[PDB]
A paper describes a structure:
The HIV-1 envelope (Env) glycoprotein is a class-I fusion protein responsible for host attachment and fusion of the viral and cellular membranes. Following expression, Env trimerizes and undergoes furin-mediated cleavage to yield non-covalent gp120-gp41 pre-fusion trimers anchored in the viral membrane. The VRC01-class of bnAbs is of particular interest for HIV-1 vaccine development due to the exceptional potency and breadth of several of its well-characterized members. To better understand the potential avenues of elicitation of VRC01-class bnAbs, we structurally characterized complexes between VRC01GL and two clade C Env constructs using a combination of cryo-electron microscopy (cryoEM) and X-ray crystallography.
We therefore engineered a disulfide bond between G459Cgp120 (426c DS-SOSIP D3†) and the VRC01GL heavy chain A60C (denoted as 426c DS-SOSIP D3†-VRC01GL). Using this method, we purified an enriched fraction of Fab-bound trimers and used this sample for structural characterization. This strategy led us to determine two cryoEM reconstructions of the 426c DS-SOSIP D3†-VRC01GL complex: one with three bound Fabs at 3.8 Å resolution, and one with two bound Fabs at 4.8 Å resolution. Throughout this process, we applied strict non-crystallographic symmetry constraints in Rosetta. The 4.8 Å asymmetric 426c DS-SOSIP D3†-VRC01GL structure bound to only two Fabs was obtained by removing one of the Fabs bound to the aforementioned model and was rigid-body docked into the 2 Fab-bound map using UCSF Chimera.. Analysis of the asymmetric 426c DS-SOSIP D3†-VRC01GL structure, comprising two Fabs, revealed that Fab-bound protomers feature slightly better-resolved density for glycan Asn386 than the free protomer when visualized at the same contour level. These observations suggest that VRC01GL may stabilize the Asn386 glycan either through reduction of its conformational freedom and/or via direct interactions with the Fab framework region. Similarly to what is observed in available VRC01MAT/SOSIP complex structures, glycan Asn197 density is also strongest when bound to VRC01GL, but appears weaker in the unbound protomer, again indicating either Fab-induced stabilization or restriction of movement. Using this crosslinking strategy, we demonstrated that VRC01GL bound to the deglycosylated 426c DS-SOSIP D3† trimer in the absence of a formed bridging sheet and that this binding stabilized surrounding CD4BS carbohydrates at position Asn197 and Asn386.
Residue numbers in the entry:
A (entry chain L): 1 to 91, 96 to 104
B (entry chain H): 1 to 52, 52A, 53 to 82, 82A, 82B, 82C, 83 to 100, 100A, ...
C (entry chain A), D (entry chain B): 33 to 56, 66 to 134, 150 to 184, 188 to 309, 312 to 358, 360 to 394, 409 to 504, 522 to 549, ...
Write the structure that this text describes.
């Protein structure tokens, strides 16, 4: 099966900064990944897919990359609005996600 | 635009069953698979299964096999999910979701508001 | 130094999206199809390794459209069961699957009505406390299949138009996705039977080497897994009943065929040898294990869905029916022949088209069908259990996957006969693909001569194809004419070779490289060269006029 | 010695099965037909003796399909008399052939009905003790001929597509089967009228030399005998009644036309001069005697059958009717004009198509038709009497025999412009058919130039024909190109003549034989030669490259 692990679990970051979120799997899945943003009381929203493509309405500053079993989400020019939970997903398998 | 409209929150007693609806609009109902996933109250998300409105075909997560069932009614573009033998640990927000592309349908771009179900 | 030389009839091609035509009062093998070619020419393209992808093969979608288009047209002139939608007063004939219903029928004279009765299956009846209606009356008008048609899945051969070719992957263990070191070219496909079925694929093709399991992506639990068997399994289905037909006049030259029963009633069923199935299952599980090396394998019944999915659907050459296959998709199997119960429908919704409906007339006497299971469609449960076991279930419904299970060996490409290469000079079927550029030049006629008229609801397609072939042919001939290379196969020009176009050794080009490899490198400057060639002839024409004026 | 030489544009042909196109809001002369060619070019092929067979001429079957296809399409948008099928309460107007019927009609508003009446002929009414129904209500729905159409048999000219030619047998006494020493070629047929009739053939073509009697086999009493007259016989038919029309609204923009009568009623009839007919009969009997040299000849009435056969059926440009011709098919004939009684139908079943039906609207005022009898259809009684007399009777019904009686002079063939002959060398319209191979070579351009675009429900046929012509043209041009004979009419090659191909004297070949005769002998090795020619060019191409490389 596929088990996704992300880190750091939590990140205390300031506006204007840059940070990245890792994601690993025990099996190679090429690039079939997705990243979701999750806010309190809100529905999940697609941020990145194919580990390269931005979802609709997502600012350029949101990106990411990876291959095989090692992937990472990259967000530049961090805003207060980014202080949410982000999940790594592969097929039906959901990771634990991290909070900014 | 497109949207998914789910029923309101519900409270049942342990051992009972719950039925949750999801109405779709803005697109061809039978165009895409409908997925169900529940968000645990302070934990990650757990995928339940999906249904294909074209034939009512389903695929359930093994761990819920025999507990959960899904169906649909195309005449009203509405999907239905039902969970029997409810337990206290089943408390969660059940989301109605649809993928972006018919090819890779795991890209859940479109979501409903989520339905909170407890015991 | 090197100069530009034009070659016509070179063995190269590219993926293309075109229309194929049908080669044979059958519902599918219509009068509009052409006679087949009894001698296919499987030319082996040694040293050619083409890559195939059954999951993106347009031939499948084209097939789907073909089958439907024919079906609809075939039933166009058939009786529309409009007046049938009346109040139904029904009673009983515990196999209470058949109800005796009476109703008011309008006679030939609009002013007159009378009583009439017919036997219908419960599955086709909807409660409206003993009054019912036909299930379709709130969706659409079902068309009664014309009394003189044939639904026998007569195999259809697909043929390419001139300028195009069909490649075959002859690698018996090909997964349907990737390189095919064993490749040949044909003019037409073999005869593929338009078998409409779910779950278990009947009367299909068998594997030539071994059982093969293929899928678009095994990691994607939303996709269907297709397994093709080498050893067939016999299955016999029968409907042991006196389904005597009755002719009811429902309009001015419109006869409705009702069912009647002379004797008693017995449920339809299928007979499949247990031992046979068990062996087949064990073999399949083994092959699956290879892909899932550290887990158990379990076969279960359908998780649920429409009857068409939960049960095994097929046309028994007569009345359509559905069988319960829970006795096969199991881990506990007996040696003894397994009997599978079935139910019969008179009102059938073809494919997944909403608003489409047909009514099947009763067949007098009993029916028995002997068929072979050649493969089946399975899907895997999502998630993973601590029990380290994977569960597979029957599925289907999208006929495209049935067609995909047969057409996976074929690929359609277009031939690009015009090529350019460097030579040391100055002016003044398809087997050659595996040959070097030099040697391949000795077969330019063999290829070129077959790029024009190799061909000598389907009508319009054939006509369109004919025109397209002409357009392409003339286009190329026009260019050769303009460049002053008319009628030639190898035409040396007056345009010098550029250094930026290639840095390959002349010897390697002609003695080692093939035309396919060359194309992939030199295509970069296709238009550049063409432009220069046109200018050259213009210069020559004015020079000739200058001389003539003297 | 002798070498292979290729000739393009040689005057030879073979039987072919192709599609001809129509050259002119008429029911038959539709908008889809082309303008006619006012100047046919009857090129006489002297010394050419072609063999014709009217009994196997596909043109006839093609004609039949054409006529029907048009008819059906023309009536497609016309009102369907569905709601007419109601209870009919009828009374009388002893010529009681017309009944006054009342019925319940549904008005524009579905919720409202009213009383209405119309006059119908007994022949169109079926008893259902004074209640009736329309005859068609248990077969199909009759379509009312649109109120603005024309059924006048406007002559249609058939024209061949490029690459094909139509041959005419101009032998005035030709039996329709065998050699025609007098033969010419045309681009189109003359205008043939689509006259639908039985027994007596009206408004047809007359014999040019004498009365001619022809049949597939006189020994076969199951076949029809066709006789064509040289001298026409005038016949005038009339319907002397006030058939005033009434417009009845039967739906939302659907008007039914009913018959009404203002004055009194008189039966329709035909007027044919007795003396005239008698003479014609005597002449025909004489010609028959020639075939049956020691027997008497008697003309009797139809043995029986449907009205359409027993009586003389024809369209009088208006309402269809049938006449009793027992007064003509007789041995006792008076000099005085013979009056033949007739009956009129409103509901007509066209041809012999079951389920096909049309309703004819009434024509206000009386109708009179003046027409000529040009020929007739007779059959002979089987067996033989000791009285040594043969009996002939009127017949018909299959319109194909009507068309066959006009198209018997035409034959369709395809031209095969490519020919090969032995010559002493080494490389480096259709009037010529009657000429020797040598002389015929002087007209290659005249012929070849007209094998491409000579042309400059019918739409699709014209389009298909255009494409076919192109395909054939290009095919031949491609071959000439490949063989290195592009642009030439007479191309000497580099392939030596074989001894096994011919043992004829060179002089005889060019000075005595014609291309047609040559083809029949040399065709044996058509493919053999073609193969060699292709190889030759391949050799030349590589030799040129070798030289160029120097
Ligand atoms: C996977 O493939 C297998 C085959 O590879 C398919 O199985 C085949 O399915 C077809 C279709 O049902 C079967 O053909 C049908 O068999 C019927 C039974 O015939 C027997 O009984 C009659 C009763 O008197 C006998 O006359 C027959 O004998 C004759 O035929 C056999 C055949 O080989 C000859 O050997 C004999 O010498 C005789 O000639 C048999 O004993 C049969 O009735 C049926 O015939 C009707 O339908 C065909 C359609 O093509 C018509 O051509 C034919 O004229 C009949 O139709 C007329 O009559 C009916 C009667 O009411 C009318 O309704 C029609 O409008 C029309 O007038 C046909 O022959 C075939 O036998 C069977 N083969 C096997 C091995 O099972 C599987 O179905 C297929 N799987 C799937 C899912 O499709
Ligand atoms: C074998 O061949 C012979 C001929 O070679 C055929 O016989 C011919 O059949 C046609 C068809 O029936 C005859 O034409 C029709 O004749 C009708 C009678 O016309 C006379 O009376 C009217 C009354 O006022 C006069 O106006 C006419 O005078 C005009 O026409 C003559 C014709 O030469 C001129 O010379 C005059 O100067 C005038 O111009 C005559 O005296 C006639 O009514 C009818 O016309 C209708 O149909 C035609 C169809 O082509 C329409 O074009 C035309 O507009 C009329 O149709 C309109 O009006 C009606 C009235 O209700 C509407 O219902 C229509 O919808 C439309 O509005 C037509 O002209 C022809 O005369 C006749 N010839 C002979 C010599 O018999 C045989 O039938 C044929 N055999 C078979 C078996 O077919
Ligand atoms: C055109 O006509 C067709 C006719 O079939 C319409 O389709 C029908 O629509 C109605 C509308 O809802 C459907 O009713 C619902 O059916 C579901 C499921 O029941 C069916 O499927 C079960 C499969 O697990 C099967 O077991 C059922 O059979 C049992 O029950 C019947 C009922 O009496 C009995 O006769 C049998 O012997 C069996 O005992 C049955 O096949 C059902 O769950 C729905 O009820 C739920 O939802 C309502 C809504 O609030 C709620 O009140 C209930 O408490 C419950 O929660 C409901 O009955 C019907 O099933 C459809 N037909 C089919 C074959 O599915 C179609 O909609 C019409 N078109 C239009 C435009 O209207
Ligand atoms: C659709 O509707 C049409 C309506 O016409 C149906 O066609 C009719 O079918 C019936 C069914 O059998 C036919 O009845 C038979 O008719 C024959 C011959 O009679 C007709 O032809 C004679 C020509 O020689 C003609 O003289 C007759 O006219 C006389 O008789 C009538 C009758 O009352 C009278 O009204 C006239 O004034 C004349 O006096 C008539 O036109 C007849 O011989 C048959 O009887 C024999 O067979 C029966 C069967 O056992 C037997 O019992 C009798 O003793 C006898 O042996 C029988 O009457 C009818 O003729 C058909 N119509 C026509 C025009 O032919 C059509 O079938 C319907 N379709 C469907 C699917 O039902
Ligand atoms: C069909 O293919 C399967 C593929 O597994 C063949 O299975 C073979 O069975 C024998 C005996 O059980 C084994 O020893 C082989 O190793 C199996 N094949 C493989 C690749 O492992 C099966 O025999 C084939 N059947 C036929 C008729 O060819
Ligand atoms: C599917 O397999 C299960 C077992 O894996 C079958 O259950 C057995 O059924 C037989 C009789 O029907 C019983 O005697 C056994 O005791 C059952 N097994 C158990 C563990 O209870 C089941 O019947 C199979 N389904 C079908 C349709 O055959
Ligand atoms: C496919 O590749 C093989 C290997 O190079 C080719 O075989 C050679 O062909 C040349 C042609 O004259 C011979 O001189 C070599 O000796 C051959 N080598 C061997 C090992 O046989 C083969 O011809 C290639 N296929 C084609 C169509 O050219
Ligand atoms: C037209 O064709 C007929 C035959 O269809 C020719 O009839 C021939 O007449 C001569 C005269 O003596 C006979 O010897 C032949 O036997 C007849 N032929 C047949 C088949 O009987 C007639 O001569 C031809 N007319 C023309 C001008 O060619
Ligand atoms: C039409 O053809 C017939 C053919 O028989 C001609 O009949 C001729 O009649 C005269 C006088 O009765 C005879 O002496 C001739 O011998 C007959 N011909 C033959 C071949 O015997 C009839 O005259 C022709 N009519 C016209 C107007 O040409
Ligand atoms: C068909 O011919 C026969 C004679 O061959 C006609 O019978 C004659 O009819 C007239 C009056 O109608 C009688 O005066 C004669 O006596 C009849 N002849 C005999 C021998 O009785 C018969 O009428 C003719 N048919 C038609 C319709 O005219
Ligand atoms: C049809 O045959 C006649 C008879 O042979 C041909 O007439 C001869 O033509 C040649 C051509 O130069 C002349 O030299 C002969 O003197 C002609 N003979 C007679 C008797 O006139 C006639 O040319 C042939 N038809 C065609 C088209 O060639
Ligand atoms: C697979 O099934 C066999 C059957 O005995 C069992 O021994 C093995 O442990 C199973 N595999 C796993 C991973 O449980
Ligand atoms: C058939 O019987 C044999 C007897 O040893 C048994 O091993 C085998 O599993 C049985 N197979 C089925 C499918 O019942
Ligand atoms: C062609 O030759 C010219 C000669 O100077 C060179 O500049 C050019 O880059 C070459 N390639 C092309 C594509 O023109
Ligand atoms: C030229 O060749 C390069 C090789 O990768 C290719 O990417 C580029 O698109 C080519 N340009 C043209 C015009 O074909
Ligand atoms: C033919 O009819 C004539 C008429 O008088 C008769 O003399 C002659 O004998 C008849 N022929 C035969 C063979 O009876
Ligand atoms: C016409 O009258 C003449 C008078 O002699 C007679 O010979 C001839 O047979 C008669 N013809 C008809 C058809 O009555
Ligand atoms: C052609 O010439 C060769 C020369 O020997 C001869 O054998 C052959 O039979 C001739 N005919 C054909 C058809 O090849
Ligand atoms: C060769 O000529 C003979 C002559 O009768 C013919 O029968 C045979 O079919 C011809 N062969 C070919 C190939 O045309």
């Amino acid at each position: 099966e596929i088990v996704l692990t992300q880190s750091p679990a939590t990140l205390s970051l300031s506006p204007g900064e840059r940070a990245t979120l890792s994601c690993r799997a025990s099996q190679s899945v090429s690039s079939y990944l997705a990243w979701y943003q999750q806010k309190p009381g809100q529905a999940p929203r697609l941020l990145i897919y194919d580990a390269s493509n931005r979802a609709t309405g997502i600012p350029a500053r949101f990106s990411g990359s990876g291959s095989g079993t090692d992937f990472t989400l990259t967000i530049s020019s961090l805003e207060p609005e980014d202080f949410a939970v982000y999940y790594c997903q592969q097929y039906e398998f959901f990771g634990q996600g991290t909070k900014l | 635009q497109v949207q998914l409209v789910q029923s309101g929150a519900e409270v049942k007693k342990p051992g009972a069953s719950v039925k949750v609806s999801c109405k779709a609009s803005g697109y061809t109902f039978t165009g895409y698979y409908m997925h169900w996933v529940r968000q645990a109250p302070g934990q990650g998300l757990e995928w339940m299964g999906w249904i294909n409105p074209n034939s009512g075909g389903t695929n359930y997560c093994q761990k819920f096999q025999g507990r959960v069932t899904m169906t649909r009614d195309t005449s009203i573009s509405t999907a239905y999910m039902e969970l029997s033998r409810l337990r206290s640990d089943d408390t969660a927000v059940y989301y109605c979701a649809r993928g972006k592309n018919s090819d890779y349908n795991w890209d859940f771009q479109h979501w409903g508001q989520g339905t909170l179900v407890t015991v | 130094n090197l100069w530009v030389t034009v070659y016509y009839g070179v063995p190269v091609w590219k993926e293309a999206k075109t229309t194929l035509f049908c080669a044979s009062h059958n519902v599918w093998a219509t009068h509009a199809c052409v006679p087949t070619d009894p001698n296919p020419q499987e030319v082996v393209l040694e040293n050619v390794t083409e890559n195939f992808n059954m999951w993106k093969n347009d031939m499948v979608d084209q097939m789907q459209e073909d089958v439907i288009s024919i079906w609809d047209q075939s039933l166009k002139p058939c009786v529309k069961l409009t007046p049938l939608c009346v109040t139904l007063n029904c009673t009983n004939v515990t196999l209470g699957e058949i109800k005796n219903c009476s109703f008011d029928i309008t006679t030939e004279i609009r002013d007159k009505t009378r009583k009439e009765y017919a036997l219908f299956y419960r599955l086709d009846i909807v409660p409206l406390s003993n009054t019912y209606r036909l299930i379709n009356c709130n969706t659409s008008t079902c068309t009664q299949a014309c009394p003189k048609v044939t639904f026998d899945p007569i195999p259809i051969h697909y043929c390419a138009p001139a300028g195009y070719a069909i490649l075959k992957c002859n690698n018996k263990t090909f997964n349907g996705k990737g390189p095919c070191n064993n490749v040949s070219t044909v003019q037409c496909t073999h005869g593929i039977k338009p078998v409409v079925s779910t779950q278990l694929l009947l009367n299909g093709s068998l594997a030539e080497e071994e059982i093969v399991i293929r899928s678009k992506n095994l990691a994607d639990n939303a996709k269907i897994i297709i397994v093709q068997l080498n050893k067939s399994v016999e299955i016999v289905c029968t409907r042991p009943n006196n389904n005597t037909r009755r002719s009811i006049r429902i309009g001015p030259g419109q006869t409705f065929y009702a069912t009647d029963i002379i004797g008693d009633i017995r449920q339809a069923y299928c007979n499949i040898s247990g031992r046979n199935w068990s062996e087949a299952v064990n073999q399949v599980k083994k092959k699956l294990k290879e892909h899932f090396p550290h887990k158990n394998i379990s076969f279960q019944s359908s998780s649920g869905g429409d009857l068409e999915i939960t049960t095994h659907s097929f046309n028994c050459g007569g009345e359509f029916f559905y069988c319960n296959t829970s006795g096969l998709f199991n881990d506990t199997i007996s040696n003894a022949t397994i009997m599978l119960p079935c139910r019969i429908k008179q009102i059938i919704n073809m494919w997944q088209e909403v608003g489409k409906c047909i009514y099947a007339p009763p067949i007098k006497g009993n029916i028995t069908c002997k068929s072979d299971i050649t493969g089946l469609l399975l899907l895997r449960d999502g998630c993973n259990t601590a029990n380290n076991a994977e569960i597979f279930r029957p599925g289907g419904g999208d006929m495209r996957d049935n067609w995909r299970s047969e057409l996976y060996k074929y690929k359609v490409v277009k031939i690009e006969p015009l090529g350019v290469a460097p030579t040391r000079c100055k002016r003044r079927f398809l087997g050659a693909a595996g040959s070097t550029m030099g040697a391949a030049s000795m077969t330019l006629t063999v290829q070129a001569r077959n790029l024009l008229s190799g061909i000598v609801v389907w009508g319009i397609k054939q006509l369109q194809a004919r025109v397209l072939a002409v357009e392409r042919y003339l286009r190329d001939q026009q260019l050769l004419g303009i460049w002053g290379c008319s009628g030639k196969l190898i035409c040396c020009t007056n345009v010098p070779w550029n250094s930026s176009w290639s840095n390959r050794n002349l010897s390697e080009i002609w003695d080692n490289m093939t035309w396919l490899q060359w194309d992939k490198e030199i295509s970069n400057y296709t238009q550049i060269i063409y432009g220069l060639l046109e200018e050259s002839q213009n210069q020559q024409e004015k020079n000739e006029q200058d001389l003539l004026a003297l």
